[PDB]
Amino acid sequence: KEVTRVLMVETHNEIYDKFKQHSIYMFFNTSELREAVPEPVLLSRAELRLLRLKLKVEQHVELYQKYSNNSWRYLSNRLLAPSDSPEWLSFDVTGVVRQWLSRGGEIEGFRLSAHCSCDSRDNTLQVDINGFTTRGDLATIHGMNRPFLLLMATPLERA
């Protein structure tokens, strides 16, 4: 009747990540560090975790899973008030990180991206953008509270 939490820290910018892709605040979890209970059968939950500090403008963001370059899977969306206090956001990414256990390489990734009101009319396009009125002034990306995965899995048995 027991379970284990784990804090899979995202990374430090030692990879193709030093302030470029730009798709704003791309997360690259070094799957080499899914050492923390790697079994997809034991995994019971997992969340992507953000810390943000925008306090004067509404921000509308979306979370995506990575595929072969310039191809993404939409996962979720958030509506961020001009909150005076910094705040922690969480996205349920259990399925994604489970698939990243049953297979995958040494780096996998998510990304945030501003929301676009995208529409068209005959012979004309319009794309309003509703997020990241800044390539980034929103999330804390290095040091304490750098993005991370919170994974909950049951080890040593599940009978």
Added chain:
Amino acid sequence: KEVTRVLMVETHNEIYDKFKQHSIYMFFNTSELREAVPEPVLLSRAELRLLRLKLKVEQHVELYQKYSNNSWRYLSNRLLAPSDSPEWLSFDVTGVVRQWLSRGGEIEGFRLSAHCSCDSRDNTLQVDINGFTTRGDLATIHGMNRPFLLLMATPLERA
């Protein structure tokens, strides 16, 4: 301890609506027919209601409130499975239709729009589109089950 439901039918295409804007499946509720309990203080809830029939491709849509032309407020988003059966969707639009009671004209409107994975890199843009793989093969727009508002308000007193 009592309340009243009302079915404010959207419209028939007798306005600038006969199969053009194109932003797919724009809803234009003729506010002249908010005769149904028009008081914003009595309004307790309201929902925009859709009937859809796409059964082979995932569709990702968004609901928007209308402003001065080519300017919109994002309201919600839906992830539609390739469901064999047609299905009814509902969006909580209480605030929007309440503001449309405390003020507004004779026509107000919402719209659906396909979701766009919008991102950028230095000197390049990319916009994938995740909905309406068709300008419309998804929602029933005329006859029985044409879009409508479901509004719940308490009449004749609220003491």
